[PDB]
Amino acid sequence: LDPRLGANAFLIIRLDRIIEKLRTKLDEAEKIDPEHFVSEIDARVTKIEGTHCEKRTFQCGGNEQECISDLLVCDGHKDCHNAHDEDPDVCDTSVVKAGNVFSGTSTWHGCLAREDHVTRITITASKRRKFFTARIWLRALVESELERHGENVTSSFNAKGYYNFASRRLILLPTDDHDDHLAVVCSFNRGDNERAECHRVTEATLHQCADLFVTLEEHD
Amino acid sequence: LDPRLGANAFLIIRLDRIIEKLRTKLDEAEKIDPEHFVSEIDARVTKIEGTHCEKRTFQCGGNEQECISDLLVCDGHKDCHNAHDEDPDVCDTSVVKAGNVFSGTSTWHGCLAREDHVTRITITASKRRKFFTARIWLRALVESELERHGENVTSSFNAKGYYNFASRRLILLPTDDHDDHLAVVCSFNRGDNERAECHRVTEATLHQCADLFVTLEEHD
Amino acid sequence: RFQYLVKNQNLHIDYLAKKLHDIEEEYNKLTHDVDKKTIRQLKARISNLEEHHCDEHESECRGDVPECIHDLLFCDGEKDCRDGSDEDPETCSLNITHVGSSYTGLATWTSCEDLNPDHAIVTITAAHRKSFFPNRVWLRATLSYELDEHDHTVSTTQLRGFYNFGKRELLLAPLKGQSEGYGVICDFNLGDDDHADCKIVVPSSLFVCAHFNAQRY
Amino acid sequence: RFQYLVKNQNLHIDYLAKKLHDIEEEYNKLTHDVDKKTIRQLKARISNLEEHHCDEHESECRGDVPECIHDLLFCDGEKDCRDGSDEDPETCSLNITHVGSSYTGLATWTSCEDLNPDHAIVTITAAHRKSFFPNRVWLRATLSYELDEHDHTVSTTQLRGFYNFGKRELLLAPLKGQSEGYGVICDFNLGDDDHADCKIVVPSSLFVCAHFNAQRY
Amino acid sequence: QSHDEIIDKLIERTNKITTSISHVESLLDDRLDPKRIRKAGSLRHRVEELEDPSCDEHEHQCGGDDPQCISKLFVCDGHNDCRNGEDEKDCTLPTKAGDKFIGDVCFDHCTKRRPEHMTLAFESSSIAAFFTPIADLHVHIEIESETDEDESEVSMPADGEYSFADHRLTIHPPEEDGLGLVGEFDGYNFDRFVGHIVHELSEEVCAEFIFHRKK
Amino acid sequence: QSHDEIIDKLIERTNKITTSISHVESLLDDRLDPKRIRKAGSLRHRVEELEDPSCDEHEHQCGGDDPQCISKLFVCDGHNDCRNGEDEKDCTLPTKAGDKFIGDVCFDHCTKRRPEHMTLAFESSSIAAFFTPIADLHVHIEIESETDEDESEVSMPADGEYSFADHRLTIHPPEEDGLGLVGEFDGYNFDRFVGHIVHELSEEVCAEFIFHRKK
Amino acid sequence: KAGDKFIGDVCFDHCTKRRPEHMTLAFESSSIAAFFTPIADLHVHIEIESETDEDESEVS
């Protein structure tokens, strides 16, 4: 009657706190994806595991082992029979897709006067064809946060360049600016997609003036 | 606290009995459709309100007032411009459709020996074309519940016949039976669809041996 | 606790709301009661159509008493009747008197029309009121009937005449000057408004040139 | 009443059931943990690939101790090793020894192949066990490589040879009697199983006729 | 505070339903509502009047789905005629007692004076315990005439019965003369009834009065 | 009866959820579960080892998202080097006290006898209150040799330190001779550490022993 | 407000060469000065999906 039923509640109230605390755990669980971490190691290791091939050649997949000249291989139509390219996993636009913002610390050799600091490469625009995998032409905004005499300032210049699917390279040159602050260059294979290894360089010299390791900032 | 909230319940418990009793009313309400009753009177009265036209002619609708020969008018294609027929309300298959069972009392002049009784006309089958409005060929089963010496017996014979859309007539003749129990004939315009006015008759004589007012029995 | 038992009370309610919606829903499925405005139309249609006691050109007073008075006496201006049934709206009505009511049907000529019976339309063009006047208008209208479907033409004669209260009958003739003009007689008495038994006559002898059962328009 | 409060208690529960389903649901959305079977494969891929101390034709005992013993001594039948690392399955394994493992890659001939580098397939046809035998098989296989795509033809030479534990290397030569037969050397040592650095040689001088990086199949 | 926020919730929802409830109870009452019933049933009657009649003049039509004809004498035996059960379900006897009815003349061949009006007072009414079908009445027919010479007033008393099915009350003639009254009801609706004055034997009609119930 | 049917309902549903709950608490623990962490982190290490290294030999790589190089001397000042906060989050000092470690020889140029084994007992260990980075140790290196003539036993004592970041304990040579031990950890995992015997000055390696923690 | 997207349907375009069918208007940020009600400052991206003769062009 009243006891076994009015007490069967102190039993249910429990499940209420439980179910709630359980919500918190499902939140903690979403932060550690195993399937994600493992992927970090895979890429991390694959990064350690040079080219057999010759540069600006494309290495085919498991089945055979052949070299293909880059431009030819990214016809946009299948380079090869198999084809390595055709498989959806590589071609997949989304990860690649610009509009991302990349930040990171730029340690200088000190071609520039100024102390170490952060750079913030942010993709402004990006044309191709409709498809168009190989090559991605793009405009972007490069900022740095450096101190002048007086307070914190920000040196931004506008840049134009391209992304080479195969190259795993993003080249950003200055537009027509009086500043004409030197060109940034980033490569993919971090093994994360997110992350890239960059360097500030001069066109003419095509030396490396500085090392810059960027990371994609979360959009939200 | 405990009073205004524990009492606000004796208030809700009320709505519980109310809402329930209210269910019963919604059940009572479905039994008297006004929109239905009114229709009964309309038909009831329209039944009182002869033909201007000549028999086996079709009276057009409101707009003009013209007579059309029956067969011609139910071409199946539009007899007339307007057309009366074409309008969906009359043509509507469903109400018309056989498979119905009709029962009722058959009062005799007493061509048959036997005391008054009930007849049960039930449509066995019904062919036409696919469309096919005008004419509906059909087979049916005619039973009566009459007493012989000894207990309650049932005289069933099988019948074949047709339904005339225009005629508002259902003619059922016996098949080849030794009994060859006389042919039943029903007309529509009761003004209900459901209900019909029938008579038992002989083919040859084409006299009326008995009056029979049937009503469609509910399928459920 | 306080917070507690409440969490479910709001549920017992969120409940009722549904058991009710599932009702108000099953309600709409079942049709809406036909618009007393329906019964009214029946009592009408029915009532318009049995004899009246009176021999010709007498009509009964509207109200409870049957009683029959001669058609003419309307109006004194004053209640001819004891009953004063008159004074009641159904007699002095606007709509009834109202001009520019049109009646049509399919005219089938005994006489003239070689062709296939055509549409006839007798419509009221003007009709005298004064102020008070409970009564019947003395009026003017037009009778139009198609030549053909083919021709797409149509005869339109102007008419003059009145409406007999007692008779329930509309009597129109050609205004004049045509010397052959044609006229038309329409009887009310279904009892309905709308509906009439019109017959195109010859304004002479009042002989039926053709007949057409009409409705308004 | 009794009936009462219950009607809602079952509701408070029918509630939890939903707040939970809306959880177990949001759970499945988030993927399933990769099959310890994944990490295992990494530790493997990784481990297969740094030097080992030993100069040639010595291999280290499997276990904790590094220690290096000469390749040959396997087997006593008995644990050559102090450690007895041997006795452990990763050494005496079935799969490892297992016959009828096939390795292929794309052979690109320095030497012969005018044409476009073709598919090479060295597959094991038989290999001696006895019972106990922790060790390396002495075996027979077949080397097949496409003539062409066009031709749709293909050379298939039979081979004889062994597998060097220490070397991680598969060494096969033409069985005989061909007098020109061709042979093949495949090095394990990614550390992986599957993967090898094979090179089609001339059974004479052991001179590299062509090279092909292989996988299993 | 915590307590309060809680408590308010449940009131305003109890009503939010108590409305949806009575809302339906209305839509239901609308399909049962009695004023609609009679109004429609009334229409039915008009129809029952049209036509060569199912039952006889004498005979009573039970209804309805299935017709059946029984004698007017025949119901309300107390045995049931009707499957339907008409001979026993029509709960109310049209004929009360004490009622006064005022008749307005409209056609009087019948009397010399012709009166404007004619009051009909019902003194007593008793039904035999065995007979439903016929209720016996005692009535005073009052009259206010003006004579040429003087004024005359009259209150002739007469016996009469009211028949069950007919709704027709026959008032046997007060007079030796055998002028009698015969009013046939619509009944409830309306207590208004047309009253024909006839030669009882002949059943010749020679005077019509519309009688209205005085309240 | 009425009471009973009621009461049962609520029990078997409280559990039907208490299951779905702990069911998830499991799937969660599966993505946090520590055995998976180390196992994966362990893999990370193998990678950190490949390559020309971010930080120096001397310098310590903070991590991680953004690299930063600070001195091995430099952490664990107590000032924070790291945004990251490495110099202070690695909760545990690898170096306990009292531990015994058994080393199995596998390459001994170094001694005459070459012993099979070599026990390493840790007598004391103290960290200076100011210095995290370096923990000073006192150790007895035990040895069971067989000499030609007789059997000899030894328990030479030596000082030594363990460096924070390096996980590398240096045991300054017991001997005048200046043969010393240098074992560099994986650390926890494994307490197993390769022990190189070197000429302290030279840092010439001339003896390798795999040391396992005795429990 | 802020964050709103607005889709415009052309109906009279002398103005551009391509004339586009449509034209999306995305509102990135919006801030009002603390002192000024009357005017709220906005930052907007005008997106466009044109088809060019040669290829397809997209703009923001």
Coordinates of N, CA and C in Angstrom, one line a residue, chain D residues 2-4 6 9-17 20 23-24 27 30 33-34 36 39-40 42-43 46-47 53 64-67 82, chain F residues 2-3 6-7 9-11 13-14 16-17 20-21 23-24 27-28 30-31 36 39-40 43 46 104-107 117 192 208 210 212:
Chain D
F2 N -5.7 4.7 -4.5 CA -4.7 3.8 -4.9 C -4.5 3.8 -6.3
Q3 N -5.6 3.9 -7.1 CA -5.4 3.7 -8.5 C -4.5 4.7 -9.1
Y4 N -4.6 5.9 -8.6 CA -4.4 7.3 -8.8 C -3.0 7.7 -9.2
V6 N -0.5 6.3 -8.9 CA 0.2 5.3 -9.7 C 0.1 5.7 -11.2
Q9 N 3.0 7.8 -11.7 CA 4.3 7.1 -11.4 C 4.8 6.4 -12.6
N10 N 3.9 5.7 -13.2 CA 4.2 4.9 -14.5 C 4.6 5.9 -15.5
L11 N 4.2 7.2 -15.4 CA 4.5 8.2 -16.3 C 5.9 8.8 -16.1
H12 N 6.2 9.0 -14.8 CA 7.5 9.5 -14.4 C 8.5 8.5 -15.0
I13 N 8.1 7.2 -15.1 CA 9.0 6.2 -15.6 C 9.0 6.2 -17.1
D14 N 7.8 6.2 -17.7 CA 7.7 6.2 -19.2 C 8.5 7.4 -19.6
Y15 N 8.7 8.3 -18.7 CA 9.6 9.5 -18.9 C 11.0 9.1 -19.0
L16 N 11.6 8.7 -17.9 CA 13.0 8.3 -17.9 C 13.3 7.4 -19.1
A17 N 12.4 6.5 -19.5 CA 12.7 5.6 -20.6 C 13.0 6.5 -21.9
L20 N 16.3 8.5 -21.7 CA 17.4 7.6 -21.8 C 17.5 7.2 -23.3
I23 N 19.3 9.2 -25.3 CA 20.7 9.2 -24.9 C 21.4 8.0 -25.7
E24 N 20.8 6.8 -25.5 CA 21.3 5.6 -26.1 C 21.4 5.9 -27.6
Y27 N 24.2 8.1 -28.5 CA 25.3 7.3 -28.3 C 25.8 6.7 -29.6
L30 N 27.8 8.4 -32.2 CA 29.2 8.4 -32.0 C 29.7 7.1 -32.0
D33 N 34.0 1.8 -30.6 CA 35.4 2.0 -30.4 C 36.1 1.1 -31.3
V34 N 37.2 1.5 -31.9 CA 37.9 0.7 -32.9 C 38.4 -0.6 -32.4
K36 N 40.7 -2.5 -29.5 CA 42.1 -2.9 -29.2 C 42.7 -3.6 -30.4
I39 N 44.7 -0.8 -32.3 CA 46.0 -0.4 -31.7 C 47.0 -1.5 -31.9
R40 N 46.6 -2.8 -31.8 CA 47.4 -3.9 -32.0 C 48.1 -3.8 -33.4
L42 N 48.7 -1.2 -35.1 CA 49.6 -0.1 -35.1 C 50.9 -0.5 -34.5
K43 N 50.9 -0.9 -33.3 CA 52.0 -1.4 -32.6 C 52.8 -2.4 -33.5
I46 N 54.2 -0.5 -36.8 CA 55.3 0.3 -36.2 C 56.5 -0.6 -35.9
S47 N 56.2 -1.5 -35.1 CA 57.3 -2.5 -34.7 C 58.0 -3.1 -35.9
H53 N 71.5 -5.0 -33.2 CA 72.8 -5.0 -32.8 C 73.5 -5.9 -33.8
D64 N 62.9 -10.5 -23.4 CA 63.3 -9.3 -22.7 C 64.7 -9.0 -22.9
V65 N 65.5 -10.1 -22.9 CA 66.9 -9.9 -23.1 C 67.1 -9.7 -24.6
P66 N 67.9 -8.8 -24.9 CA 68.4 -8.5 -26.2 C 69.0 -9.7 -26.9
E67 N 69.7 -10.5 -26.1 CA 70.9 -11.2 -26.4 C 70.9 -11.8 -27.7
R82 N 68.7 -19.4 -23.4 CA 68.5 -19.4 -22.0 C 67.1 -19.1 -21.6
Chain F
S2 N -6.6 -4.1 -6.3 CA -6.5 -2.9 -7.0 C -5.3 -2.3 -6.6
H3 N -5.0 -2.5 -5.3 CA -3.8 -1.8 -4.8 C -2.7 -2.5 -5.6
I6 N -1.4 -2.1 -9.3 CA -0.7 -0.8 -9.3 C 0.7 -1.0 -9.0
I7 N 1.0 -1.5 -7.8 CA 2.2 -1.2 -7.1 C 3.4 -1.8 -7.9
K9 N 4.2 -2.0 -10.9 CA 4.5 -1.4 -12.2 C 5.9 -0.8 -12.2
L10 N 6.1 0.1 -11.2 CA 7.1 1.0 -11.1 C 8.5 0.4 -10.7
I11 N 8.5 -0.8 -10.1 CA 9.8 -1.4 -9.8 C 10.6 -1.7 -11.0
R13 N 10.6 -1.0 -14.0 CA 10.9 0.0 -14.9 C 12.0 0.9 -14.4
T14 N 12.2 0.9 -13.1 CA 13.3 1.6 -12.4 C 14.6 1.0 -12.8
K16 N 14.8 -1.2 -15.6 CA 14.9 -1.2 -17.0 C 15.6 0.1 -17.5
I17 N 15.8 1.0 -16.6 CA 16.6 2.3 -17.0 C 17.9 2.3 -16.3
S20 N 20.1 0.9 -18.9 CA 20.4 1.8 -20.0 C 21.4 2.8 -19.5
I21 N 21.4 3.1 -18.2 CA 22.3 4.1 -17.7 C 23.7 3.6 -17.6
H23 N 24.8 1.2 -18.9 CA 25.2 0.8 -20.2 C 26.0 1.8 -20.9
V24 N 25.6 3.1 -20.8 CA 26.3 4.2 -21.4 C 27.6 4.5 -20.6
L27 N 30.2 2.6 -22.1 CA 30.7 3.1 -23.4 C 31.5 4.4 -23.2
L28 N 31.3 5.1 -22.2 CA 32.0 6.3 -21.9 C 33.4 5.9 -21.4
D30 N 34.9 3.4 -21.8 CA 35.6 2.8 -22.9 C 36.5 3.8 -23.7
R31 N 36.0 5.0 -23.7 CA 36.8 6.0 -24.4 C 37.7 6.8 -23.5
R36 N 43.8 2.1 -22.3 CA 43.8 2.5 -23.7 C 44.7 3.8 -23.8
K39 N 48.5 2.9 -23.6 CA 48.7 2.2 -24.8 C 48.9 3.1 -26.0
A40 N 48.0 4.1 -26.1 CA 48.1 5.0 -27.2 C 49.2 6.0 -27.0
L43 N 52.4 4.7 -28.0 CA 52.6 4.8 -29.5 C 53.1 6.2 -29.8
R46 N 56.9 6.4 -29.4 CA 57.7 5.8 -30.5 C 57.9 6.8 -31.6
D104 N 69.9 -8.0 -16.4 CA 70.4 -9.2 -17.1 C 71.4 -8.7 -18.2
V105 N 72.6 -9.2 -18.1 CA 73.7 -8.8 -19.0 C 73.3 -9.2 -20.4
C106 N 74.0 -8.6 -21.4 CA 73.8 -9.0 -22.7 C 74.9 -8.5 -23.6
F107 N 75.9 -7.9 -23.0 CA 77.0 -7.3 -23.8 C 77.9 -6.6 -22.7
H117 N 74.3 -11.5 -13.9 CA 73.2 -10.5 -13.5 C 73.9 -9.4 -12.8
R192 N 61.4 -1.4 -16.5 CA 62.4 -1.9 -17.3 C 63.2 -0.8 -18.0
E208 N 75.9 -3.3 -21.6 CA 74.5 -3.1 -21.6 C 73.8 -4.2 -20.8
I210 N 69.8 -5.2 -19.3 CA 68.4 -4.8 -19.3 C 67.9 -4.9 -17.8
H212 N 65.2 -4.9 -14.9 CA 63.7 -5.1 -14.6 C 63.5 -4.8 -13.2

